[PDB]
Write a protein that binds this ligand. Structure first.
Ligand SMILES: N#Cc1cn([C@@H]2O[C@H](CO)[C@@H](O)[C@H]2O)c2ncnc(N)c12
Ligand SMILES: [Zn+2]
Ligand SMILES: [Zn+2]
Lengths: 116, 301
């Protein structure tokens, strides 16, 4: 019945003014990539930074179980593209946002599927 | 320069051929630092440059390639070097990493513990080690060949590196091993490669290219480390991050190098020649299974 809610805790810690998780592993890349959110190799475009996925996963970084009956990690072993404007807090960004299942872009940061 | 636009500098062949005596390493650029791109870690830059240099060698790159990376953790609890290796290597490459201390990684599997506890059933196509004990950097005592994890690495290479495979093992002025240099003579080619981002340090990666499983050349490792220090002492390397800004050709080309199982009797000179050219890997293609030995103790009463 009792489960630690790590996601909520980071969110509240951030709103309380706490410093975001650091030492996310930023990759060197061309920044001419597809811009999709989570990829097998860095795919940042001109407006993004690419990061090693494990280092941007709240569950990986805080040594807690993954929110998944399988415990499978969405980010470990992959690269996550983060908008440059949000790259001071990749863990926050990945937690607070969601990937369009059709085009693979971040909803609100690349996904255009909801356009006329 | 020209050198400043390369990923780093490899030890020129003539320095390998000397018979120098070991001296203290005194680097002119000691204390210089390269200007890293914004927000990029030293370890990401260093591994990027290592991989850029490895792109210029005749690495064997089979389907279902197997790579193991020792010393992969950081005091930060992450694995920047692993993240670069996985970007570099073809998608699908099996990547295992390890460190004495806990860390989270993008590797397919991670083992925490002293490297001497690590065992694998299978052979590997590439071994990378950044393992280092900063207590070796003590200038008040004599600089002898070191054992420890280097003894493990030497055995691991001879027992678990596929013929045709390659290694890159980090050394410094004081972190080195004579048998490891000697084992460089069991590859078709070898060098000591210094990254341009960390050129102010006596660090180098000892690279053995295309393993042959037997000595092609007899190397005295005490002499060769003295030769390496002599080179470093007399050839200042300009700190440079220039190569980090061009990643268009970074990925390791998937060559689909052939993998064959072969018994010792079948390694003729035509096989040895293919091995030496980066055109063949000899090992089993079974499943990759690893383990870490755990010492059990009960300290109650
Ligand atoms: N001596 C020694 C070792 C040092 N390291 C690690 O190399 C990394 C140094 O950059 C660091 O993260 C460290 O924890 C070792 N890892 C496994 N087995 C060892 N025997 C060692
Ligand atoms: Zn995770
Ligand atoms: Zn979409």
């Amino acid at each position: 019945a009792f489960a630690v809610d790590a996601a909520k805790a980071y969110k509240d810690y951030l709103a309380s003014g706490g410093q975001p998780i650091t030492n996310c592993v930023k990759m060197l890349c061309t920044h001419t990539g597809t811009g999709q959110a989570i990829t097998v190799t860095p795919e940042a475009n001109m407006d993004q930074e690419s990061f090693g996925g494990a280092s941007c996963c709240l569950y990986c970084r805080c040594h807690i179980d993954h929110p998944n009956p399988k415990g499978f990690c969405d980010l470990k072993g992959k690269y996550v593209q983060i908008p440059t404007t949000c790259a001071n807090d990749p863990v926050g960004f990945t937690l607070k946002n969601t990937v369009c299942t059709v085009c693979g872009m971040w909803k609100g940061y690349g996904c255009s599927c909801d356009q006329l | 320069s020209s050198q400043a636009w390369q990923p780093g500098v490899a030890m020129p062949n003539l320095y390998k051929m000397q018979r120098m005596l070991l001296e203290k390493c005194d680097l002119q650029n000691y204390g210089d630092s390269a200007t890293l791109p914004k927000g990029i870690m030293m370890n990401v830059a260093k591994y990027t440059q290592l991989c850029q240099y490895l792109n210029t060698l005749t690495l064997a790159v089979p389907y279902n390639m197997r790579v193991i990376h020792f010393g992969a953790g950081s005091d930060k609890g992450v694995a920047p070097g692993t993240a670069v290796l996985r970007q570099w290597l073809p998608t699908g490459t099996l990547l295992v990493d390890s460190d004495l201390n806990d860390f989270v990684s993008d590797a397919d599997s991670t083992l925490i513990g002293d490297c001497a506890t690590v065992h694998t059933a299978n052979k590997w196509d590439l071994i990378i080690s950044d393992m280092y004990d900063p207590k070796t950097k003590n200038v008040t005592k004599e600089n002898d060949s070191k054992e420890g994890f280097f003894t493990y690495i030497c055995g691991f290479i001879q027992q678990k590196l596929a013929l045709g495979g390659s290694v890159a093992i980090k050394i410094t002025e004081h972190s080195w091993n004579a048998d490891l240099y000697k084992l460089m003579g069991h590859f078709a080619w070898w060098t000591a490669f210094v990254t341009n981002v960390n050129a102010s340090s006596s660090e180098a990666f000892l690279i053995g290219c295309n393993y042959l499983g037997k000595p092609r050349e007899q190397i005295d490792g005490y002499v060769m480390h003295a030769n390496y220090i002599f080179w470093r002492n007399t050839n200042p390397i300009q700190l440079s991050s220039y190569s980090l800004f061009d990643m268009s050709k970074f990925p390791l080309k998937l060559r689909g190098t052939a993998v064959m199982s072969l018994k010792e009797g079948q390694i003729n000179d035509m096989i040895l020649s293919l091995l030496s050219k980066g055109r063949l890997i000899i090992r089993e293609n079974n499943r990759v299974v690893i383990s870490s030995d755990v010492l059990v103790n009960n300290e109650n009463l």
